Design a protein around this ligand. Structure first.
Ligand SMILES: Cc1n[nH]c2c[nH]nc12
Length: 255
């Protein structure tokens, strides 16, 4: 909460590195004893307390976590203009990174990002925290072998129970991770491209699933289809996913 208060003069604003829900995201420097590279989330309408509460809720959420593959909260500036200071992931959005590098990223690197993500999600499951929005767009790239989970209606990523009843559980997070894994092996291509959101549920309920991505190991696809069990109680947990992705990665790093 308040132990994360940073005074503004300890922050040098830099160039705009993208956009967020509340305002522009900036690169910048945080000076305090060694002047570190950071991401400054801004909020244009934060003069209104209802917006301010919603915006600073991400800071409140992220304070609770400490993991190598979850974006770190550095601090907050509660006075106007309200800012959220975070760890900078220089390579940006995963979706864009995967697209740009479609012919410059091997299978091993793709499986590695899936593995890394499963470790952040196993950690969140251990804290009994439900993410509700696991998708490639919410993953950031720190380096070419280090991705981070960054965000704290996506019908095409949602488990049927989330669509039908707005139920969000650890099981529904596993479904979304399966979709995210598919997005990674499909080089940032969006799931169900061409299908209307309202027709997705009907396809799922007819047993229809996202196809095997080209060059995807059938063992990795078998893991994804397990995430897409209609019955949430039949889906694996992140602990098992992490362990299986770990073995799949070695099965690739060798041959
Ligand atoms: C946080 C955050 N949002 N966008 C970013 C790029 N690097 N770090 C971040």
């Amino acid at each position: 909460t308040r132990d994360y208060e940073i005074q503004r003069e300890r922050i040098e604003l830099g160039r705009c590195i993208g956009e967020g829900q509340f305002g522009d995201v900036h690169q910048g420097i945080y000076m305090s004893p060694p002047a570190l590279a950071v991401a400054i989330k801004t909020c244009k309408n934060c003069t209104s307390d209802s917006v301010r509460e919603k915006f600073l809720q991400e800071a409140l959420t992220m304070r609770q976590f400490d993991h190598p593959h979850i974006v770190k909260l550095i601090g907050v500036i509660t006075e106007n203009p309200v800012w959220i200071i975070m760890e900078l992931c220089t390579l940006g959005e995963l979706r864009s990174f995967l697209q740009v590098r479609k012919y410059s990223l091997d299978l091993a690197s793709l499986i590695l990002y899936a593995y890394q993500l499963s470790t952040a999600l196993a950690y969140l499951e251990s804290k009994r925290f439900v993410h509700r929005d696991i998708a490639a767009r919410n993953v950031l790239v720190s380096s070419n072998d280090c991705v981070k989970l960054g965000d704290f209606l996506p019908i095409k990523w949602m488990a049927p129970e989330s669509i039908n009843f707005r139920r969000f559980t650890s099981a529904s997070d596993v479904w979304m991770f399966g979709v995210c894994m598919w997005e990674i092996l499909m080089h940032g291509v969006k799931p169900f491209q061409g299908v209307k959101n309202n027709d997705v549920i009907g396809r799922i309920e007819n047993g229809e699933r996202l196809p095997m991505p080209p060059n995807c190991p059938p063992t990795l696809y078998s893991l994804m289809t397990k995430c897409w069990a209609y019955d949430p109680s039949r889906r694996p947990r992140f602990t098992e996913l992490k362990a299986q992705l770990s073995t799949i990665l070695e099965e690739e790093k060798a041959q």
